[PDB]
Design a protein around this ligand. Structure first.
Ligand code: TE4
Ligand code: TE4
Lengths: 154, 154
């Protein structure tokens, strides 16, 4: 599932990680689990790369991180340069309310439901759950509006 | 949601904790989270109480535990004696394949999908997810057949 006709410039700005799901419990279990990452801001570049500002709990504190996802020939697919080739996939967005994405290796998967506002969007969560229905996810987390306004959703 | 016409004697024997969900991430997050409990065996007593054999990861090892849930005037509701009054609710069972239950305080909630066999029962999981749809759950875990045959689902 990919977003046809994605305009990456229109995903700019503030986002909340309302929900997260992953193929492996260990990817999301603890506050310090590897893919327990809280999106803050998406900053698409003029050349169409994607800078991601996020928070991650590591070494007993809520740390700031900056990821750059490089564009590919497919608008809805980005690459993160590391020891491993990992793909960022944009499944679905309306730009103004929700965005669904997955991070996949070469498989392990973590996906999130991003929303624009610190509110539980049952409709976005329905799109999120329907997107994942056939994906092999074994852990799903969702956050309340109080948590969404805290550093690392504490 | 309670099981009408529950015969507690018919839930005896081997069960697998195929899936678990809870109101609070912290109840299920880590292997050592309080309600990360793996059912082994249900042993109803002649007088209609329920002994539960389970495993729980505590102090760096998979520990054996025995819980007794006392019957109430409602067949599908049991009480666990502690500092807190906690209710065990039997939502649904066919005795031969699946059983859904919740543990609730006075609220925080943890629920499980129990199955008779180390197999992913998509139908039981559908009943589980439909039962929880309006419950305020923020963490959901499910286990693969390999994990289901390991002590504490490692
Ligand atoms: C619209 C796309 C949003 C993408 N958001 C994110 C993309 C990646 C990550 C992320 O945490 O990536 C780290 C994994 N690397 C090191 C392989 C977190 C959020
Ligand atoms: C058919 C009913 C099955 C009930 N199964 C279980 C019931 C209770 C627990 C359980 O872990 O209870 C501990 C909580 N106490 C100390 C308040 C675990 C499993």
């Amino acid at each position: 599932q990919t977003m046809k006709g994605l305009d990456i410039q229109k995903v700019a700005g503030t986002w909340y990680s309302l929900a997260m799901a992953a193929s492996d419990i260990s990817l999301l279990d603890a506050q310090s689990a590897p893919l327990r990452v809280y999106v803050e801001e998406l900053k698409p570049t003029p050349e169409g790369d994607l800078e991601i500002l996020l928070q991650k709990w590591e070494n007993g504190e809520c740390a700031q991180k900056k990821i750059i996802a490089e564009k590919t020939k497919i608008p809805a697919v980005f690459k993160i340069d590391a020891l491993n080739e990992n793909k960022v996939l944009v499944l679905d967005t309306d730009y103004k309310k929700y965005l669904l994405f997955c991070l996949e290796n070469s498989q392990s998967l973590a996906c999130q439901c991003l929303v624009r506002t610190p509110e539980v969007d049952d409709e976005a969560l329905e799109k999120f759950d329907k997107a994942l229905k056939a994906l092999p996810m074994h852990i799903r987390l969702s956050f309340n509006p109080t948590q969404l306004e805290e550093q690392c959703h504490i």
